[model samples]
Target: HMNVLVIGRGGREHAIAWKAAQSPLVGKLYVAPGNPGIADVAELVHIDELDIEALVQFAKQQAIDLTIVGPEAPLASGIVDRFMAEGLRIFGPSQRAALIEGSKAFAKELMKKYGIPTADHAAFTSYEEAKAYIEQKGAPIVIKADGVTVAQTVEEALAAAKAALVDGQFGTAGSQVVIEEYLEGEEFSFMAFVNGEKVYPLAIAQDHKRAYDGDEGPNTGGMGAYSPVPQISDEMMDAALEAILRPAAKALAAEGRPFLGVLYAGLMATANGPKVIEFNARFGDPEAQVVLPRLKTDLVEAVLAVMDGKELELEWTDEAVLGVVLAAKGYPGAYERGAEIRGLDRISPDALLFHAGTKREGGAWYTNGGRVLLLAAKGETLAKAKEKAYEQLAAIDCDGLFYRRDIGRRAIE
Candidate 1:
């Protein structure tokens, strides 16, 4: 039997304590600043997470065999260092090692020095100095100011993004440039409706992240997407749910950052399991072109349910849907706008057309944003959907419109 002390106060801690209580080897479970529900299974201590000395003492008081970290703040604060010095077993990196996360400057320097495959970045104690660096860098660059830009090759994207930083172009929250290890596997966009413990998933989709065919070119907002992902089987999805998403979500909540929006977890399939690439706070676009076509329920209701702390109800279409973005020629930047868009009325009654970066003027739609529009089509199979989408691409004509011809090719071949 083991005595364990979990740190945190949200549903994740509740679930963790509950699950820990079930362990045949668990003699006693303790949660620091735990919630009402967790009290049923574990002893709840009133100590705050930042109270490292108290936490260490509490471990000794309760004969805690293991102390688990629930947040990075505590980890960065040297909780592991404190625990280890007292000779208590703990889970987490020491404060010095955790500088990889605690400070971006340290991490970027480490990666650069070690020649680790990572986004190239410059650290700045000065925002103006960073601003100057960004201007010279170009679009598709990541900003530690910061954001990693999307592009065809790392060499080009990194070089360009370093410049794009000055423009404030990546997105609204373009302050941090962070990227995962570029995991090579199928990427699934898993958005969850969570109040902390349970996660309600949305329909799965495969998104193309590159700018051109064969995934070559700088990355843009998105080029295309398709629903009814065949690459990840149900078993794989189940394993993903079991191994990462739920646990991360629960843990996020446990840290008092209970999420209530779409927790978009970008995942990769590996030999071991579906590991994470990234997680976003809102719905992903260009991807919206395909998934919205499959949702039987109104999109607003799902988000509303999440905010209401109620359950999400979703019904997915068996039919497949695919879409391709109509981008301005020079996108993701330096693209000409006000390009006339034609053939909306000429498109066959079959396909779904949504304007992402378009506006109506003088009774006509014109290109406005770099990613101007999406040509979404539905069919019995994803292959059929691709065919229909391509067929419509021939119908729409715009002065500077360019798009990928091979969207969803992996699904078919």
Candidate 2:
């Protein structure tokens, strides 16, 4: 049995911790700055996630055999590099390899250079220049100011660019923006564990990015997600790995920055084929909550095999997993915190609960983030899974939290 440390405080990290706890090879599991939900499965460490030095020292002191990074911020800030310098075994990409997600411009250029299929895009640092280009390009364009905003008109595109570059709405990440032509298709998330050029793909999922029902709200991190996306055929998944995932990994390795963790490809299955929407450095939050449950492979052993430069055949259950996010009211905007939550014990033991923005105080849980927690259920079919998830969600009572009722509805309909 080996000791493991999983970094970050979110539902995704909680899911990772839960999976690691199931592995017989894992002895002691620890989560750094973990949420209240994770405490159920692993011991919580008070150290901040980005405090690389403290993390490295703690790993050494605790004799941690392997450390898994859960969020992109620490990876983007070079936590993996710092760990490697201290002779710690960490599962994540280096700072240079993390640029694939840190800089949209770099990712776009890399895809173009490697002939990875993606949308036609332009990058700019000046608001005026971006405005000029949008005027020439026309409407239905996508403006990414560190975040994605779909603009239906030229004015909307210019306004979005101005808000990012001139107004500094997105801060340093928005100083430069990438403008892309909107690719029309059904979107799906394709995530893989990449050890340099070797890619082991996971069950595909589709996340609801909109904050409200009917996809008619401002963009949020994600409201809900379901794994084993029924609409995306196995052929489409293979095509995505061939045309997008493999090429991107090979390109990064050729660029002298070999990737060593999860590579998330946000793709659009268009008339032509699967096209890249964006790249994420770590596991997608709600997506992880749904997908990881279907993984039949032992999480700890898989990471160890990848670290050892060995090939491991991964397995998955045929069952579908669906998860719904319980976010604080007014999320993706101004949202209050610290609302008392109850009825946790009312939830059935069969469902899985993963916490994100939550804190335990005096034996009670309180809201602590925009996304508070998640309840997931696995079933033989998507409809059954959705039903079970909602049934579990109904057991919890929190005045400050809200969730979309239509998760997995599109697929089942």
Predicted model with the maximum TM-score: 2
Write candidate 1's Cα lDDT for 307-341 as tens digits.
45676678888999998888889987698888888
Give the top-scoring candidate (lDDT): 2
Candidate 2 per-residue C-alpha lDDT over 363-395 given as tens digits, one digit per residue, 9 for 90 to 100? 888999999999999999999999999988988
Instruction: Indicate the residue-level lDDT of 114 in model 1.
Output: 38
Looking at model 2, the pairs that clash are none
TM-scores of all candidate predictions against the true structure: 0.58, 0.92
Q: How well does model 1 score by local distance difference test?
A: 0.66
Candidate 2 has an lDDT of: 0.91
Off by over 4 Å in 1: 1-182
- In candidate 2, how many clashes are counted? 0
